[PDB]
């Protein structure tokens, strides 16, 4: 598990697939971008309970959610679709697994689009995110 401080400061989440940072747009679209200065990739992780986080786009003021068909969007209000198990994998990247749809992961495709929940799974490059400083 992670200590305090992981949650104190905002983060960028760097995806192994394509080198995309996870981006939360003002209108609730979620996607990836390679540019580290994009203002919409500054995220805030918040511990909801042990090993569970919500992920907020700071500038968008919206929380990452995974929907029942597997799509990603970001909502103004926190709901049960906004919670993820955060786990450090053996390769030192993290995964984010839906607490509601427990086989599905937050993931980005090589195109920059999100990858639909049902196509995700362990061992994919698409599900691996490295948190780092937002500075």
Residue numbers in the entry: 20 to 154
The authors write:
Canonical FGFs including FGF2 act as a paracrine and/or an autocrine by forming ternary complexes with FGF receptors (FGFRs) and heparan sulfate proteoglycans (HSPGs) on the cell surface. The FGFR-FGF-HSPG complex induces the dimerization of FGFR, resulting in a series of intracellular signaling cascades including the activation of MAPK/ERK pathway, PI3K/AKT pathway, and PLCγ pathway, etc. Through these signaling pathways, FGF2 regulates diverse cellular responses and has beneficial effects on wound healing, wrinkle reduction, and protection against neomycin-induced hair cell loss.
To improve the thermo-stability of FGF2, we designed two mutants harboring four-point mutations: FGF2-M1 (D28E/C78L/C96I/S137P) and FGF2-M2 (D28E/C78I/C96I/S137P) through bioinformatics, molecular thermodynamics, and molecular modeling. The crystallization of FGF2-M1 was successful in the absence of SOS. The RMSD value between the structures of the FGF2 mutants was 0.144 Å for all Cα atoms, indicating that the introduction of mutations did not affect the overall structure of FGF2. The D28E mutation is situated at the end of the N-terminal loop (residues 20–28 in the structure of FGF2-M1) independent from the β-trefoil fold of FGF2. The B´ value of the N-terminal loop was 2.82 Å2, suggesting that the region could be structurally disordered and easily exposed to protease. Structural analysis of the model structure showed that the side chain of D28E was at least 7.5 Å away from the surface of FGFR1c, indicating that the mutation at position 28 only confers resistance to fragmentation of FGF2 without affecting its interaction with FGFR1c. P137 is located at the end of the β11 strand and contacts with the side-chain indole ring of W123, positioned at the beginning of the β10 strand. Therefore, S137P seems to improve the thermo-stability of FGF2 by anchoring the beginning and end of the β10–β11 hairpin such as a knot.
